[PDB]
Nucleic acid binder design. Structure first.
Ligand code: MG
Ligand code: MG
Ligand code: MG
Ligand code: MG
Ligand code: MG
Ligand code: MG
Ligand code: MG
Ligand code: MG
Ligand code: MG
Ligand code: MG
Ligand code: MG
Ligand code: MG
Ligand code: MG
Ligand code: MG
Ligand code: MG
Ligand code: MG
Ligand code: MG
Ligand code: MG
Ligand code: MG
Ligand code: MG
Ligand code: MG
Ligand code: MG
Ligand code: MG
Lengths: 117, 154, 70
RNA sequence: CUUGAGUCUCGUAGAGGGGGGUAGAAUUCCAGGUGUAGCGGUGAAAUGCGUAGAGAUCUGGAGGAAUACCGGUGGCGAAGGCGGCCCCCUGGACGAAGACUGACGCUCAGGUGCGAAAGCGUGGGGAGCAAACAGGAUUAGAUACCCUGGUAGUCCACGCCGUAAACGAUGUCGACUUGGAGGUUGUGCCCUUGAGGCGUGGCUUCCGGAGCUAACGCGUUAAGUCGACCGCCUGGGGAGUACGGCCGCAAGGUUAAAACUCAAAUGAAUUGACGGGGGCCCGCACAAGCGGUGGAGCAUGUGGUUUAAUUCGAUGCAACGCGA
């Protein structure tokens, strides 16, 4: 029911999946969408196209809120990391700032062991 | 082939209507090198179709082709050890050829008695967009849509 | 890799700057390397291999590739 | 006596060691807000988590471990090893000029100390990871690889253990023998005219001459030419095993045989072949297409069975309408 005009698009782009989440500038989430829910599984949801349609879906979902400006915070190494932002722009927000917030540790916790494939 | 960009071969246009496309259709239809028979069948089908549907033989034929050509087909790209069905835009010469092939196969299947009759019925159906060749095209498109995620990552 | 789209900057252009900034930062490379635990011995060995290969290649190009190829 | 060896003076660089604080990023968990059906994972799945509201996102809190960038064939250390920042204690190396002692040196069986990781004892701690273990896949099976979990352990204190491909697979000390390109850290002169010119020490990387080597290669940091001392080897297996001794809480470590058995076992390089190596390329090899065979009847050849005989031969492609 409310209007905000200016949101943040948090694009969590892991290798398996892309989660797009539109939020108010404060942190409160408005709508979200994933390639999984967008209708892609496995090899198909780990692709740029899936991310794009997820982004489109998210934009549609938050259409009620009437969001006009949008800053995008990209996280993780992902097949989308670009498709989502392109899709969002096409869906027709003014992209104001694009920021990378991928969490790199300063040599912290030990990663899991290497896969033998 | 590996090392060949061979020149496309010369097809003569059919005598009745002077059309290369029609000639190609006749060739596809033909069996056992029996061209005369194929041309007779094609002409009979065209004449019936023109009478039933309208304008000319060539215009009716074109309409059917338009409703049965595929924009996109799928190939199997096998790079990551597994095979990805990738969509791919089908070039115009192939579009005509594939459509013609589909139409002839559908006609062969069809239950009407004479070949000419089957062909005429199939063509008319294609024109309307409720036949089997058209169904085949639809299936091809459906597959392409399904595998659209693998379109521009070959 | 923070970017702010300037006044009258096209979107494609903005995207280009963002990608360049990320590449310069080296975020993707860092994440990929930190995906799994490389053993210290493995890290040392890889470093040694990289150093050897780089040196050998440079020497080969500059000094060995000063002859008539045809 | 002063050239080896050491002392003193002044500086230098350093993840050298011990102790105590602290910082930020990130993971985990906890509480709360927003919010809604997915998340997670894989080659593809499932187990797992989520409508009891997860994942995502913002705030706050707890706690443990490790210190991104700098970061380097860089540095330090006898080796093992050492990596945020700050302080306290502390060892060594190097250069400069002198001054001092006056062979005080080198090596070392026994002996003594130090000695990664795993492991052990006692007491803490426990985020992440993860032997064992559990479930899901894969598979002929899969007590594995992959996935989701996960306990010892990894961390701290103090003891033990005492071994590693603990490797430069190269014992320590000293002298001598053509070069080139670097890195690092001192120092003398040159106006530093600029980041710069010419020297002279230390450590260090690569290339290469003579010489050496079975060859590969080593080559002023030698595997070259020599001297001192030590350690060790004498065919493969049996076997670094048994017995005995010593050490250890244990796991085990260390010292260390014999019978019996074979005529080889090995090192380096060469030519092939092969690779679920790599690069380049071709062929109805695939792909794109068209028509068949495999089902039916019959012809024909073969296997088999049968027969008195069913003549003999061909029998993966490259025998089977073949000799015929
Ligand atoms: Mg994983
Ligand atoms: Mg220091
Ligand atoms: Mg030193
Ligand atoms: Mg001894
Ligand atoms: Mg330990
Ligand atoms: Mg313990
Ligand atoms: Mg304990
Ligand atoms: Mg785990
Ligand atoms: Mg596991
Ligand atoms: Mg040993
Ligand atoms: Mg070592
Ligand atoms: Mg040894
Ligand atoms: Mg000694
Ligand atoms: Mg050399
Ligand atoms: Mg013997
Ligand atoms: Mg023993
Ligand atoms: Mg014993
Ligand atoms: Mg084929
Ligand atoms: Mg048959
Ligand atoms: Mg049969
Ligand atoms: Mg046979
Ligand atoms: Mg015979
Ligand atoms: Mg025979």
């Amino acid at each position: 029911r409310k209007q905000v005009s200016d949101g943040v698009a948090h694009i969590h782009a892991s290798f398996n999946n892309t989660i797009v989440t539109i939020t108010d500038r404060q942190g409160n989430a408005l709508g979200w969408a994933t390639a999984g829910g967008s209708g892609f599984r496995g090899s198909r949801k780990s692709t740029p196209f899936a991310a794009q349609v997820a982004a489109e879906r998210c934009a549609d979902a938050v259409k009620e809120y009437g969001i006009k400006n949008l800053e995008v915070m990209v996280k993780g190494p992902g097949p989308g990391r670009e498709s989502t932002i392109r899709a969002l722009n096409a869906a027709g927000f003014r992209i104001t700032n694009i920021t990378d917030v991928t969490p790199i540790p300063h040599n912290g916790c030990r990663p899991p062991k290497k896969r033998r494939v | 082939p590996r090392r060949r960009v061979i020149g496309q071969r010369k097809i003569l246009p059919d005598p009745k209507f002077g059309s290369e496309l029609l000639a190609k259709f006749v060739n596809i239809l033909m069996v056992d090198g029996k061209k005369s028979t194929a041309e007779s069948i094609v002409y009979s089908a065209l004449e019936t179709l023109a009478q039933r549907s309208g304008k000319s033989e060539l215009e009716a034929f074109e309409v059917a082709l338009e409703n049965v050509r595929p924009t996109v087909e799928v190939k199997s790209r096998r790079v990551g050890g597994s095979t990805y069905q990738v969509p791919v835009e089908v070039r115009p010469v192939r579009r005509n050829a594939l459509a013609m092939r589909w139409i002839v196969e559908a006609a062969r299947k069809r239950g009407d008695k004479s070949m000419a009759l089957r062909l005429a019925n199939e063509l008319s159906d294609a024109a309307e967009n409720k036949g089997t060749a058209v169904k085949k095209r639809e299936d091809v498109h459906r597959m392409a849509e399904a595998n659209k995620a693998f379109a521009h990552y070959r | 890799p923070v970017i702010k789209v300037r006044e009258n900057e096209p979107f494609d252009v903005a995207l280009r700057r963002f990608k360049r900034s990320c590449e310069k930062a080296g975020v993707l490379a860092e994440v990929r390397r930190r995906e799994f635990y490389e053993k210290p011995t493995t890290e040392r060995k890889r470093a040694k291999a990289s150093a050897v290969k780089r040196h050998a290649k440079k020497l080969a190009r500059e000094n060995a590739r000063r002859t008539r190829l045809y």
